[PDB]
Design a protein around this ligand. Structure first.
Ligand SMILES: [Mg+2]
Ligand SMILES: [Mg+2]
Ligand SMILES: [Mg+2]
Ligand SMILES: [Mg+2]
Ligand SMILES: [Mg+2]
Ligand SMILES: [Mg+2]
Ligand SMILES: [Mg+2]
Ligand SMILES: [Mg+2]
Lengths: 109, 44, 53, 223, 4, 49, 49, 176
RNA sequence: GCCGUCGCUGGCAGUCGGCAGAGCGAGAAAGAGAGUGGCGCGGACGCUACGCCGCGACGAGUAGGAGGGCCGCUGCGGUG
RNA sequence: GGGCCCGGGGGGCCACGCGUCCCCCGCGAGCGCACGGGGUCGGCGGCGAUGUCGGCUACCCACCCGACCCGUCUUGAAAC
RNA sequence: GUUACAGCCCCGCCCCGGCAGCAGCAGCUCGCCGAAUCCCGGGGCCGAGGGAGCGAGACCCGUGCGCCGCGCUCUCCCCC
């Protein structure tokens, strides 16, 4: 067993300077620091994974405190490897600067 | 972007495209044939 | 123009031809050839500044 | 009635034939191929007979009904969709599974089933993955291949063979490995396994598990 | 007519 | 058939201008093509002020 | 070509109608012998009568 | 004119429109360094207007075409005669450049005239461009490359890949 | 995509059914004309016409004007 | 180059009945696939009775971005 | 000082001296294009509408893949 996802940081939301578009998240991925290295990740699944107080069901498992908001990478962002991600619900602002998981599927290689 | 939509408007588009596909494939073959002849000539 | 129009309208009618009657704005000039007559075009250059004060 | 003949217009591209109308007309010889202009069942009864109505009118009508749909085209059922496959996934290719309990295990691709799902084997003796179906979008195809060109896979290994059989609970109900499945596992494994052992260290590779580690980034490394 |  | 004819017409117009210029150059002269008859205009400014 | 094909809308009965059928052109401009997209492209491109 | 990108040399031929008085007006030519041809024709009408009683309305462009460099693979010294307006006058200058294409030397001129004199390209009128032999050059910066046995190192080679890696264990080396 | 407004002073009385026969969107006026001589008993919804349906464009607003409120309050005649 | 790319002596054609006079020299049948008048599957998986599933808005709390107190006179009000 | 033990530039004749190649997979030495332009692939968002009829017909009461556009096959016979 071992890790099967790439380490990403929830950098912030899509924004100008004084307007915030919370439906899109800007993700920084480890080792991706050019716009041309982001092509592998486009369309990949993203998962903000966290813990809460009340137990919740787990697919293929028994209830625990883990929770996840799913999303996927939609496009690159800027010249330095950032990608825009969209989630089934807008990410909470408390998650900025914290881990976002980037999966290896849907695989295109 | 939609072939059958273009033909409902301009039926002659189908002839034009078929000729292009055939002409371009024919032209590609010659460039390959002309290349092989020169390469073999260089080998000589 | 009315008198000229009517005559052309009348005269052309008996000769079975269609002539233009309506004026038109000046069209873009049509393609043509410029003969050089074996003379190279004169080269022009900007002149130096001079304080002719 | 004549026998069907293969289309005389070879496909140049999708929707365009190789030959024009007049070219096809000559090819089909259309110059000489010219042409010119129950509901009731009667039965006996012990009246003598009755005219029986095959289908009877409804005995109940809902207060409201929905209208019909407008007709569309190109919306085929799943069974009629065309199946695609990545050029990198060729039979004998080693795939890394990304999901399920077997995630991270390197398996051997055998063939694509009629539903587009992939057939893979562990083989069971190397990583404990049996003859199993998997989805191509959820695997990573490596560049490591073995030649299973001479392997005969049973023809009864179809989508219907691998489809889950529903289990009813009123406590639980446990899946049981059928004896046919075990026999099939040895039939396929007994051929693929020797081919695995020809490649040095390959068997150890199939026992190991894939994982991402410090400084290893998927976009950088060849599989 | 000719077509027929 | 109208499209088939316009295709030939467009080709003749395109080839004709090239042929005209080639013969002017051959003779050492200049072929000045016809001033364009058609323009496509695009509005690039808003409606304020 | 690309302008009239991708973004060609007729002004028919003072409405904006996508030119998805040749009949749309023929009914309105047929009296001038413009009856298909190619005739419409030819009239515009060559600045016909 | 905006000296956008590398300029090109254009050969522009124009004349007065023929009239009953002069059925064949004389032809004039100009060397125009511009970004594209649409700009090239515009600047032609600006120069001939300054020299002749002519302008776009009462004249036509007989020929506009790009003049290609004749020896793009050979090093040359260029002399450029130009006049420009400063904040407080007009001046004539002679400058020299070393390049492979005459249009490259002119592009160097605009970037250089902007750098050393804050001269925007709308104030610069390039009068003349000539290829000059090494013996006839005047500028010491150009003459020092006229040395058959020229040699020199590359001291203190600055690190240009300063964010790959952004954080590193070893300090860079500037000596090579 | 959805809401409303404006426009087409747009379409629908044709639900013309076994006293039946299913159309009137179509580039280019005017008739799915009339005649005189040479087995089963069946066939959705609709239409408060102040109703229902379609298509296209559009939508800032103080002072001010107008419309619509199956918005709200109290009492009277009818009605439930 | 243009003349349905004039006339004479390997490759594509939205050529393909014929009686004729002669410039010139009004209905065939079927069947099938679809880049064809706006999406469907005639495709699947997991979990579920005492701790779990769904509940926009609403109650409390947190975070990110935004955010000056209304009415009024006024050219101008968050106005000291 | 003038090709020598390296080379550079210009001019005449050598078919513009001859050969590749040709806005070059020497994947960057310099352009503008596509009736002189086609093929394929990847990611993202979305699915509004809901009776379009077809053919048999007054010797028929069926069937809901129906318009327009583009194809295929059969009503001929051979060969691989
Ligand atoms: Mg402004
Ligand atoms: Mg308003
Ligand atoms: Mg703030
Ligand atoms: Mg504040
Ligand atoms: Mg006040
Ligand atoms: Mg005051
Ligand atoms: Mg106030
Ligand atoms: Mg104050």
């Amino acid at each position: 067993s071992g890790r099967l996802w790439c380490k990403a940081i929830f950098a912030g939301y899509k924004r100008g300077l004084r307007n915030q578009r919370e439906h899109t998240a800007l993700l920084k991925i480890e080792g991706v620091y050019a716009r041309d290295e982001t092509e592998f990740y486009l369309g990949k699944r993203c998962a903000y994974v966290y813990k809460a107080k009340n137990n919740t069901v787990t697919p293929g498992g028994k209830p625990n405190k883990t929770r996840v908001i799913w999303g996927k990478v939609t496009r690159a962002h800027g010249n330095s490897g950032m990608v825009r991600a969209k989630f089934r619900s807008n990410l909470p602002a408390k998650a900025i600067g914290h881990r976002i998981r980037v999966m290896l599927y849907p695989s295109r290689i | 972007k939609n072939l059958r939509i273009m033909l409902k408007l301009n039926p002659y588009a189908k002839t034009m495209r078929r000729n292009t596909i055939l002409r371009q494939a024919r032209n590609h073959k010659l460039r390959v044939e002309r290349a092989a002849a020169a390469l073999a000539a260089k080998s000589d | 123009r009315v008198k000229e129009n009517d005559q052309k309208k009348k005269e052309a009618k008996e000769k079975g031809t269609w002539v233009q009657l309506k004026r038109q704005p000046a069209p873009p000039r049509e393609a043509h050839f410029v003969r050089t007559n074996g003379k190279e075009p004169e080269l022009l250059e900007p002149i130096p500044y001079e304080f002719m004060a | 009635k004549g026998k069907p003949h293969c289309s005389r217009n070879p496909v140049l591209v999708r929707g365009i034939g190789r030959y024009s109308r007049s070219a096809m007309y000559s090819r089909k010889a259309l110059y000489k191929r010219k042409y010119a202009a129950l509901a009731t069942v009667t039965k006996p009864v012990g009246g003598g007979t009755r005219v029986v109505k095959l289908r009877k009118m409804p005995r109940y009508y809902p207060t409201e009904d929905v209208p019909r749909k407008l007709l569309s085209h190109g919306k085929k059922p799943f069974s009629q969709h065309v199946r695609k496959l990545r050029a990198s996934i060729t039979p004998g290719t080693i795939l890394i599974i990304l999901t399920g309990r077997h995630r991270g295990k390197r398996v051997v691709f055998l063939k694509q089933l009629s539903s587009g799902l992939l057939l893979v084997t562990g083989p069971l003796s190397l990583n404990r993955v049996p003859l199993r179906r998997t989805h191509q979008k959820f695997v990573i195809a490596t560049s490591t291949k073995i030649d299973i060109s001479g392997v005969k896979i049973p023809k009864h290994l179809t989508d219907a063979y691998f489809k889950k059989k529903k289990l009813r609970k009123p406590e639980k109900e446990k899946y049981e490995i059928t004896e046919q499945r075990k026999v099939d596992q040895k039939a396929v494994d007994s051929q693929i396994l020797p081919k695995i052992k020809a490649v040095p260290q390959l068997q150890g590779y199939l026992r190991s598990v894939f994982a991402l580690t410090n400084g290893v980034y998927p976009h950088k490394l060849v599989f | 007519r000719g077509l027929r | 058939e109208k499209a088939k004819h316009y295709h030939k017409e467009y080709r003749q117009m395109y080839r004709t201008e090239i042929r005209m210029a080639r013969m002017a150059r051959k003779a050492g002269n200049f072929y000045v093509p016809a001033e364009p008859k058609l323009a496509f205009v695009i509005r690039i400014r808003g409606i304020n002020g | 070509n690309e302008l009239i094909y991708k973004r060609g809308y007729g002004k028919i009965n003072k409405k904006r109608i996508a030119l998805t059928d040749n009949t749309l052109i023929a009914r309105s401009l047929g009296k001038y012998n413009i009856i298909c997209m190619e005739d419409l492209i030819h009239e515009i491109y060559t600045v016909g009568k | 004119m905006k000296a956008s990108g590398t300029l090109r040399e254009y050969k522009v031929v124009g004349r007065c429109l023929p009239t009953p008085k002069c059925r064949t007006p004389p032809l004039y030519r100009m060397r125009i360094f511009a970004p594209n041809h649409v700009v090239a024709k515009s600047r032609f009408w600006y120069f001939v207007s300054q020299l002749k009683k002519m302008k776009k309305s009462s004249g036509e462009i007989v020929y506009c075409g790009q003049v290609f460099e004749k020896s793009p693979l050979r090093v040359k010294n260029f002399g450029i005669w130009l006049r420009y307006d400063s904040r407080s006058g007009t001046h004539n200058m002679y400058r020299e450049y070393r390049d492979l294409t005459t249009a490259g030397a002119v592009t160097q001129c605009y970037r250089d005239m902007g750098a050393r004199h804050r001269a925007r390209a709308h104030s610069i009128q390039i009068m003349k461009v000539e290829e000059i032999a090494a013996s006839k050059c005047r500028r010491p910066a150009v003459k020092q490359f006229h040395d058959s046995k020229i040699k020199f190192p590359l001291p203190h080679r600055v690190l240009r890949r300063q964010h790959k890696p952004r954080f590193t264990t070893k300090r860079p080396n500037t000596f090579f």
